[PDB]
Design a protein around this ligand. Structure first.
Ligand SMILES: Nc1ncnc2c1ncn2[C@@H]1O[C@H](COP(=O)(O)OP(=O)(O)OP(=O)(O)O)[C@@H](O)[C@H]1O
Ligand SMILES: Nc1ncnc2c1ncn2[C@@H]1O[C@H](COP(=O)(O)OP(=O)(O)O)[C@@H](O)[C@H]1O
Ligand SMILES: [Zn+2]
Ligand SMILES: [Zn+2]
Lengths: 561, 474
């Protein structure tokens, strides 16, 4: 039937009881959602060498042995590996790093040797080494002799297996730099897979999978939950479901007695999770994936960015044509631009434009905010520039958006970034976008050819741009019917997008204040023109005239040259 | 030689090497994985797993299992080396010729040919595991010797080796007969000229090999009588006292060095002779319990370069002094304390011999199994060299013992009387029988399907002459 299984028959084929009930393993491909690309890569690397070795013999190639797999914790790496192992239906030998490292001296090596030898005996085999960073850490951090011995044993075993063997090794780690570099060469963990946070569709799929056994109430809007939840890895969603169930139980506690050992079945039948429970769980949830740099998945288009039509078409020509039409570049032998740098007053929407550009080529997105760069400069952060570019390579194509670059480019970090950029593969489609407010203050060394040589000026929005921004921002907010924003736009000459968002937020705050006051005294389904009038009266341009004059003078000087 | 050495050894070694000895284990309750795929607790247990041995009350690891451990520990296949012999018998003798620029040891030495400090430590693998006595008579007669005379005894024990299922890859030495060399036993000890003993034993062992036996140890009795009404004996060998004093350890080490075990996994081709020594002392009660022992390999290579001598303290062995042709480096013996820390104590004046021994398990064949004893005998024709007692081999005893049976027939009765080890040895000594006639005699007396061979033997003129002279003789 399925899951290599051959009403009772359907249950047996998957189409004491406690040992199996708590051991409901054999999680197939139906238990994973939102990671179609990574799952496809893993399946291609694993199944074919084992299921169909004849192809490689026919062509005459050696299938890769190692498959490194790294990503943020709680993203389901171990679950994905277990699902692959079970679906392939082949012998597989678990190895948990902490357990191997939690044994007397002179026995961890014995366990590793036994594992590899046994996996060799019953080929085909899949050795899944979990938390490989706990047994082969970076050399400097752990100088313990036993750790070096274990690393050497692992390296020897890894080298010695690549001979007419059907053993495929899968490893999991938090970051690509935690593992000792010696395990990332030929005949070793060379093929790497990066797992990023799921997008809206991924979160919806995860919620669907988790919320299949729970007795949901009919008033569930999982689409709203998927839209709201951002930066939620699978573990966070599971904890969210648990919190929702706990909140429902707490609400229903009024009809149950703590002292009584037994609980009425009729009361149990009324445990229905409501949207309120999910909202409370969201209130209590503590996502942490964004604390470190991770590969996102943007979905912006050429509709959220108003104006900048010349800039839009220039970016299209500079980016899409290489990626989408490499044939013409190869025909003319022209190297595509390796980056571009945006300069202009703050709040003009550089990030939105970069995200839209990244979405155009249908590529993942990495964001590196300035504080993270500063933390790396001070050496008090887990990640690193080398790690960022390694993840970008593993997840290519990608767009790496450096933000607040002027903070560090007023040294070590700048030189390291230059090294990483120059050493990057030109042919590979990886682009680096930069954001800054002080283009002159940027280190000139960056603007050399083969680097962020292209300069693009992002001007303040005009009347049409302001109108478009106002229209876009108010999509998720009711407004007075027949309300025109052209007057507001023209009265807001010189304002930036951030100022317009602040105006809208203040008007909505006044509206909610009025509604709350009226209800307390107890009606306001819309936002009347008085709210917007007062908000406009109580707002000011965030850009001083002097900065605008200097920016335009600098732009004119750049044009003249 | 680009791989393992090429040589032919005992069949037991071959058959043991063929096996792997893995002890299977079933799904533990702590596993987290589907039916297929074993994580860490469901894996087969290697035969050398010390936890299993110490959990089953086995003090040593069945040498072949130790060989498997050593082979697994290194020697990767298809690459990584060109084969390094895993077993090497330690040698302490100073290299007489090193010559980095210095002259031989007597008047010059460097730091490259200086015997490094020796760290004595109890061995962990015992070559031969179980010593097995086929029948109670074989040792009952030996002890009867002491009963009658009162003096101690000493005798080699011939036999053959075989598997031992009760232990992982274990070996058992089944002893078939005991031969007593000419020795001068006494109340407190025994003495015997080595030259005569070896000269006699050469031919005796040649005849035994012709018969299919092999010399597989020495057994001596250290028994004293107690004051109880019955026959009770003190237990002078217990934990507090000495298990084996210095001199017996020295003699056992010499014997082991002179009976090397041929092995395929050493540069020289031999390692840790499969020689077992048995001593009769008496258990904590008045019984006459026996015991077995075997001196470790270091002691085997220690006595060869002298370096050890007996001490007035029974439980300690004296250490000799440096001199030309004999260089003795500092000897550290390593023990364990009650806090789980190994302590190295220098013992130059004298050190206990408990670190130079490994103990074997004696026993007897199950009394409800098939009988494969070579000789249904040993209560008959008196043994060889019991001159001190009245027993004496000669024509008259043969006439009294093996005449009426032959003169009439009843071959079923005759066969057992002809399958006596000492009887065969004596008749061969007489040289009356022809070589091939004696060969068929032994083939009839030590093998089944003997009817035709026995009839042929009684046909041959040699046997007719034997019986005729026996009858004629008084
Ligand atoms: N598609 C999915 N992606 C991520 N998590 C998922 C997915 N589907 C279900 N989950 C749930 O997310 C959690 C992932 O736990 P898991 O142990 O796999 O995380 P991990 O961080 O990869 O593990 P480890 O660091 O121990 O290797 C589990 O609750 C799993 O049920
Ligand atoms: N077309 C647009 N032009 C300008 N700003 C916009 C536009 N669309 C949205 N915005 C708003 O402008 C803000 C810009 O934020 P960010 O990109 O972090 O700063 P900056 O734009 O100065 O780099 C966003 O919070 C967004 O809500
Ligand atoms: Zn298991
Ligand atoms: Zn020398």
């Amino acid at each position: 039937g399925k899951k290599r299984k051959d009403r009772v028959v359907r249950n047996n084929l998957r189409i004491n009881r406690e040992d199996e009930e708590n051991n409901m393993n054999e999680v197939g491909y139906d238990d994973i959602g939102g990671c179609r690309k990574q799952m496809a890569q893993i399946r291609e690397m694993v199944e074919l060498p084992l299921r169909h070795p004849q192809l490689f013999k026919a062509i005459g190639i050696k299938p890769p042995r190692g498959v490194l797999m790294y990503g943020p914790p709680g993203t389901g790496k171990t679950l994905m590996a277990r699902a692959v192992a079970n679906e392939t239906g082949a012998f597989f030998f678990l190895i948990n790093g902490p357990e191997v490292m939690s044994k007397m001296a002179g026995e961890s090596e014995s366990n590793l040797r036994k594992a590899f030898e046994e996996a060799e005996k019953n080929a085909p085999a899949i050795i899944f080494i979990d938390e490989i960073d706990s047994i082969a850490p970076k050399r400097d951090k752990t100088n313990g002799e036993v750790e070096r011995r274990v690393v050497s044993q692992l390296l020897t075993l890894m080298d010695g297996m690549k001979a007419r063997s059907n053993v495929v090794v899968i490893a999991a780690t938090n970051r690509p730099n935690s593992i000792d570099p010696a395990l990332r060469r030929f005949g070793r963990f060379d093929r790497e897979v990066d797992i990023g946070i799921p997008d809206a569709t991924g979160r919806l799929e995860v919620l669907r999978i988790h919320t299949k056994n729970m007795k949901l109430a009919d008033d569930v809007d999982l689409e709203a939950l998927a839209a709201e939840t951002h930066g939620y890895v699978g573990a966070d969603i599971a904890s969210l479901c648990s919190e929702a169930a706990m909140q429902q139980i707490r609400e229903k506690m009024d009809l149950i007695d703590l002292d009584e050992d037994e609980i009425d079945a009729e009361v149990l039948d009324s445990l229905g999770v409501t949207m309120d429970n999910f909202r409370f769980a969201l209130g209590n949830s503590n996502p942490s994936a964004l604390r470190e740099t991770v590969v996102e998945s943007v979905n912006v288009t050429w509709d959220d960015v108003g104006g900048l039509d010349e800039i839009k078409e220039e970016l299209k020509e500079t980016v899409e044509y290489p990626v989408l039409h490499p044939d013409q570049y190869t025909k003319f032998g022209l190297s595509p631009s390796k980056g571009v740098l945006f300069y202009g007053p703050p709040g003009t929407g550089k990030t939105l434009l970069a995200k839209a550009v990244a979405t155009e080529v249908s590529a993942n997105f990495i964001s590196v905010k300035g504080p993270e760069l500063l933390s790396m400069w001070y050496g008090e952060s887990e990640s690193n520039i080398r790690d960022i570019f390694d993840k970008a390579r593993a997840a290519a194509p990608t767009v790496v958006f450096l933000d607040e670059l002027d903070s560090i480019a007023k040294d070590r970090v700048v030189n390291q970034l230059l090294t990483e950029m120059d050493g990057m593969n030109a042919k590979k489609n990886v682009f680096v976008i930069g954001a800054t407010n002080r283009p002159d203050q940027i280190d000139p060394a960056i603007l050399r050819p083969g680097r962020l040589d292209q300069l693009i000026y992002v001007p303040l929005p005009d009347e049409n741009a302001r109108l478009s921004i106002l229209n876009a921002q108010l999509r998720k907010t009711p407004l007075e019917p027949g309300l025109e924003l052209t007057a507001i736009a023209k009265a807001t000459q010189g304002f930036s997008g951030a100022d317009l968002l602040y105006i809208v937020q203040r008007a909505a705050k006044y509206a909610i204040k009025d509604s709350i006051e009226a209800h307390r005294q107890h009606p306001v389904p819309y936002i009347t023109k008085e709210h917007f009038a007062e908000a406009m009266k109580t707002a000011k341009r965030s850009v001083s005239d002097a900065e605008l004059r200097r920016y335009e003078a600098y732009s004119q000087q750049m044009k003249a040259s | 030689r680009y791989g393992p050495l090429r040589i032919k050894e005992l069949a037991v070694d071959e058959e043991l090497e063929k096996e792997d000895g893995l002890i299977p284990r079933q799904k533990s309750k702590l596993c987290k994985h589907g039916d297929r795929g074993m994580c860490e607790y469901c894996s087969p247990l290697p035969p050398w797993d010390k936890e299993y041995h110490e959990k089953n009350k086995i003090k040593h690891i069945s040498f072949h299992s130790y060989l498997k451990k050593l082979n697994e520990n290194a020697n990767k296949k298809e690459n990584g080396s060109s084969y390094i012999s895993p077993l090497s018998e330690p040698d302490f003798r100073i290299n007489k010729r090193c010559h980095n620029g210095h002259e031989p040891w007597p008047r010059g030495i460097c730091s490259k040919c200086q015997p490094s400090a020796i760290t004595l430590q109890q061995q962990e693998f015992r070559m031969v595991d179980h010593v097995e006595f086929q029948k109670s008579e074989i040792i009952n007669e030996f002890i009867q010797a002491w009963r009658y005379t009162g003096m101690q005894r000493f005798g080699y024990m011939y036999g053959s080796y075989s598997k031992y299922d009760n232990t992982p890859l274990g070996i058992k030495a089944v002893v078939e007969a005991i031969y007593e060399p000419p020795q001068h036993d006494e109340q407190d000890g025994l003495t015997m000229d080595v030259e005569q003993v070896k000269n006699e034993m050469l031919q005796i062992d040649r005849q035994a090999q012709e018969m299919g036996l092999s010399r597989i140890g020495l057994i001596f009795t250290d028994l004293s009588d107690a004051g109880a009404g019955d026959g009770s004996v003190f237990c002078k060998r217990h934990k507090d006292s000495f298990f084996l004093s210095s001199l017996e350890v020295i003699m056992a080490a010499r014997h082991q060095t002179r009976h090397p075990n041929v092995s395929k996994y050493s540069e020289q081709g031999f390692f840790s002779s499969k020689f077992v020594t048995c001593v009769i002392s008496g258990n904590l009660e008045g019984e006459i319990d026996i015991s077995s022992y075997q001196v470790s390999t270091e002691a085997e290579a220690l006595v060869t370069a002298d370096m050890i001598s007996g001490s007035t303290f029974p439980s300690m062995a004296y250490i000799n002094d440096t001199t030309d042709e004999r260089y003795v480096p500092e000897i550290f013996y390593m023990k364990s304390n009650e806090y789980g820390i190994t302590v190295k104590e220098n013992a130059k004046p004298a050190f206990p011999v408990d670190y130079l021994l490994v103990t074997l398990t004696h026993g007897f064949p199950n009394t409800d199994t098939e009988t494969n004893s070579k000789f249904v005998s040993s209560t008959g024709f008196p043994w060889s060299n019991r001159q001190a007692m009245g027993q004496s081999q000669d024509y008259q005893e043969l006439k009294k013992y093996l005449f009426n049976v032959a003169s009439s027939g009843d071959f079923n009765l005759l066969h057992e009387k002809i399958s006596n080890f000492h009887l065969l040895l004596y008749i061969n000594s007489l040289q009356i029988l022809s070589p091939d006639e004696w060969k068929l005699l032994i083939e009839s007396a030590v093998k089944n399907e003997w009817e035709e061979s026995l009839l042929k033997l009684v046909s041959s003129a040699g046997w007719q002459t034997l019986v005729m002279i026996l009858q004629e003789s008084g």
